[PDB]
């Protein structure tokens, strides 16, 4: 699927903005400011949970471009890291969607967030 | 999600780039051109099952753009029939590759891809 490491790009960037809009979201209801609906959001974060999984393949070998830093190469083991945070912040945020209990999804939903800040910080232009 | 029609409009190319990735790379194993790993196709078909029911609600009220024709919403019974001869040909696709049967995914892979072409053909510019 990725021919050219523009065609890895293309798809990177299609589902970063696919799992930024499914996440970004379910902000007003760990807010408080929209009413917890717990079964539409079990679905909404199984959503992002397929989506959270298919961005990490399109950063292989050789397929600098777009707005991604070349240190995710150069220090692959950080970046692997930071990826392993945020997918790992996933996992919470499903178990916490699963089981219904709004305190638990705000506080993954926190963890989050802050984790693709750390990732944007380091290694997004 | 969609604030302005612009919104919906990144958001359905942006899942249209990521289900045509994930429908596109199957076409080596349904031509018999690469081995068939039943479990491999399986999870990849899931993956496809999820990323197409995503563009639809994208399309609502008020979101003209792109390269979407006006008549999805002139037409909008028409159109619904396109859309759901997709979406049912993802679930005979499914249904295949959850039953590891490698011709019934060759049917319904060209099925999708008809209904692909068909729905290109009267809605997109
Ligand atoms: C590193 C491990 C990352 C994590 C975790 C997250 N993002 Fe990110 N993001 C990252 C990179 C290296 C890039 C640039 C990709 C490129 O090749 O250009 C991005 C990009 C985005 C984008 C823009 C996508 C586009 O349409 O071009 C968005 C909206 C975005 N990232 C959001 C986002 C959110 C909401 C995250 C957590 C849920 C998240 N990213 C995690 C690196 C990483
Ligand atoms: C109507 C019911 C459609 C079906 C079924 C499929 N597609 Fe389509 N597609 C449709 C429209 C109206 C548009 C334009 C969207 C816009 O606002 O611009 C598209 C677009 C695409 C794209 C381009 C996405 C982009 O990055 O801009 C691709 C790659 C695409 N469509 C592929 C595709 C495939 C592979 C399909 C079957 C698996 C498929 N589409 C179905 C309308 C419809």
Same mark, same amino acid.
């Given at each position: 699927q990725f021919a050219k490491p523009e065609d890895a790009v293309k798809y990177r960037q299609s589902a970063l903005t696919?799992? #930024?809009?499914? @996440? !970004?979201?379910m902000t007003p209801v760990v807010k408080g400011q929209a009413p917890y609906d717990a079964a539409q959001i079990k679905a909404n974060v199984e959503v992002l949970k397929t989506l959270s999984a298919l961005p990490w393949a399109a950063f292989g070998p050789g397929t600098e471009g777009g707005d991604a830093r070349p240190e995710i190469w150069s220090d692959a083991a950080s970046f692997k890291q930071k990826q392993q945070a945020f997918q790992d912040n996933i996992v919470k945020l499903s178990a916490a969607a699963d089981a !219904? *209990?709004? *305190?638990?999804?705000? #506080? #993954? @939903? !926190? *963890?989050? !967030? #802050?984790?693709?800040?750390a990732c944007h910080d380091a290694y997004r232009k």
């Open positions: 696919l799992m #930024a809009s499914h @996440f !970004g979201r !219904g *209990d709004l *305190d638990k999804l705000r #506080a #993954a @939903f !926190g *963890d989050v !967030g #802050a984790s693709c800040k």
